[PDB]
Write a protein that binds this ligand. Structure first.
Ligand SMILES: [N+]
Ligand SMILES: [N+]
Lengths: 405, 405
């Protein structure tokens, strides 16, 4: 029913402005978290975040970047990398009805929305707002701002599902390939980092605040002393392609997506049920004859969420649990981008034969009884990896990637 | 392959709070547009809007509504209606893995993003923000605030695509059914109506500003003196159900979704290319052996967009021009909620045998010289109908619905 593989990837995150710098952080277990004067100044309780250490000035043409917000900028630079890394040229993916793009952001653009309102409420009104805000503020800014400049002609929309946003874009891209509708679909997303949005999460008490003095130690998934997640920003993009088409062009193939799970909890608004995650991982694992060697969990670094996922994993596997690591302990939570960025970390691990360490665990949580929680970079021969993404609204996404035959 | 049908629908729009109210408005060409003091006081040049005439206070459990924004409220009340109209009992759709939800909004909640920022900058800081701003402001709010209370266990996420949003949610739900992954998928969308989001359209010059004195005359698609669209809010939801599942339970079936097109322009950020729309409609018409009796056009009432759509239609049908009307002339533009609301108008026209009028056409633009644009309510036995939805970012969606035997 048509198979789907990844033929290229691109990424911009708190731990790397490309897959090279990223692979390096993953191996040394480098933290992307830094104290942020912006957050502390806004009056927040959280003073840390996984910021992108990149000066994007001049990296994008003036007539293009003028419609974009940081989530569009981070996803656009990621799409440039994935295109090159996929070995694709304009002639092959542009003005091609069979090449699409499905990417989005978890929160559109709080920053430009507040800028519009603030500017509008000033003496210059509409003239201060300017004619470029709609595209920066709209929820589909990440897919709109890339499909136009990259001249995409197939599918063009953004899936939004909070923290599982970019995992669903990929899953949806696969279904496009499976349905025989598209030969290639660029899938992923981005997310800006600003107080405007982070203050909403702190007001909800979901961001760690007891470690503003040891930033690199704030995100500490599965540690009995975790107190919430560290907000992060960035972008990511993967080239999802139909198998025959990619073998035909002699493309590099990182892996085949043999599993995609999308489920709903129908329970709580801001906390996972666990019952949903269980069914979600199982749906993804359905059909996959190879065991899951590694699992990049959601591991948000929150008291409730972490404990829930652990029980869920123990329910799906039990004793025969795969290696597990919460890359968020070092990268933070890029919210909408977390899905694609974590699918990439999973691919790099599968590609280079290793397992990133779950860092900052000065004391494991009782809820992680018989689970293989890797806490040190371990060289292993991976064949089948799994990534879990959970978001508010009890929305769940699970992806299973396996090395080709 | 599996077939998808519509078995229930629900709606809250500027022209009606339920299908009956709306049917009557369409039948009689009644405008849902009014003068807005809120837009005039904000400093905007456009002072007209398609507002929902309904105080929603108390129609939703306080426990639930505390997490919602106006886009979620409109879509949630639409769903209650759809569930009832489809004759679905709670045990029939609740906690059911084969029942999902796909519904989004175009901008989430500009109002609440700004609230968080205005609050955070005040003397109360975080204490004034509150722990409910997140689910209100996020892009997936519409799907999260509905999936949870209705105990949805299947698919759960939003699709954002500016003005094509809910149309893509519908197409996606069909895809879920064609892939055999779900039996029912509530598809739809919601949009809030506020100056925060509106001024942004006005600073772009996309809103009508010359008819503030004569509100119901502002929205005039295909009229030589049109000058932009009238912003509007509201919500809509339809029940997409697998054909065998619907017939088995003796469900009332409005029509089958026989065609679905999703395409990209890869040209201009805010103006339609026309070329992408031509492909979008031909894609949706693939395999459909019956002619299109009525076309509910995008018809935003804009100088450029109205022209481009008429050109696309000309190319698609040639001399076999079907009946055409732009319901937006009387409803305004509900952005993210437009796709599901206009499919519903179309369904009601197909269900009751009539063609709503394209009002306000005092002087037919030259571009439409050779077309069958209906300006007076005309009774007629329709069988197959199409509805176009185009949005910024060059995103395109087309739905073709057909009566069943
Ligand atoms: N993950
Ligand atoms: N339409």
């Amino acid at each position: 029913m048509k198979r789907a593989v990844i033929t290229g990837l691109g990424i911009v995150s708190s731990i790397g402005n490309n897959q090279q710098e990223v692979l390096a952080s993953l191996r040394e277990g480098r933290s992307g978290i830094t104290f942020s004067q912006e957050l502390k100044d806004s009056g927040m309780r959280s003073h840390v975040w996984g910021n992108v250490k990149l000066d994007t000035t001049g990296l994008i043409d003036r007539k293009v970047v003028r419609f974009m917000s940081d989530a569009s900028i981070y996803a656009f630079l990621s799409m440039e990398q994935a295109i090159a890394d996929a070995g694709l040229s304009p002639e092959a993916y542009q003005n091609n009805p069979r090449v699409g793009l499905i990417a989005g952001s978890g929160g559109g653009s709080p920053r430009f929305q507040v800028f519009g309102a603030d500017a509008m409420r000033g003496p210059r009104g509409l003239k201060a707002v300017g004619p470029y805000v709609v595209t920066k503020a709209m929820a589909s800014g990440v897919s709109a701002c890339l499909a136009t400049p990259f001249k995409i002609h197939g599918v063009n929309y953004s899936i939004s599902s909070a923290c599982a946003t970019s995992a669903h874009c990929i899953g949806n891209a696969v279904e496009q390939i499976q349905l025989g509708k598209q030969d290639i679909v660029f899938a992923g997303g981005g997310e800006e980092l600003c107080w405007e949005m982070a203050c909403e999460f702190d007001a909800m008490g979901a961001l760690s605040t007891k470690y503003n003095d040891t930033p690199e130690k704030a995100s500490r998934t599965y540690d009995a002393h975790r107190d919430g997640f560290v907000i992060a920003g960035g972008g990511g993009m993967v080239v999802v392609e139909e198998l025959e088409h990619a073998l035909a062009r002699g493309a590099h193939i990182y892996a085949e997506i043999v599993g995609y799970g999308a489920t709903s909890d129908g329970a709580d608004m801001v906390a996972p049920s666990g019952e949903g995650a269980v069914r979600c991982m199982k749906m993804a694992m359905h059909g996959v004859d190879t065991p899951i060697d590694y699992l990049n969990s959601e591991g948000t670094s929150t008291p409730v969420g972490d404990v829930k996922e652990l029980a869920a994993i123990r329910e799906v596997f039990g004793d025969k649990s795969p290696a597990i690591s919460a890359t968020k302990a070092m990268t933070g939570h890029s919210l909408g981008a977390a899905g694609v960025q974590e699918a990439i970390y999973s691919l790099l691990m599968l590609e280079h034969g290793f397992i990133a360490p779950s860092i900052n665990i000065e004391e494991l949580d009782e809820q992680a009884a018989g689970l293989n929680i890797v806490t040190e970079t371990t060289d292993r021969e991976l064949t089948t990896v799994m990534s879990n993404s959970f978001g508010f609204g009890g929305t769940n996404a699970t992806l299973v990637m396996r090395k080709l035959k």
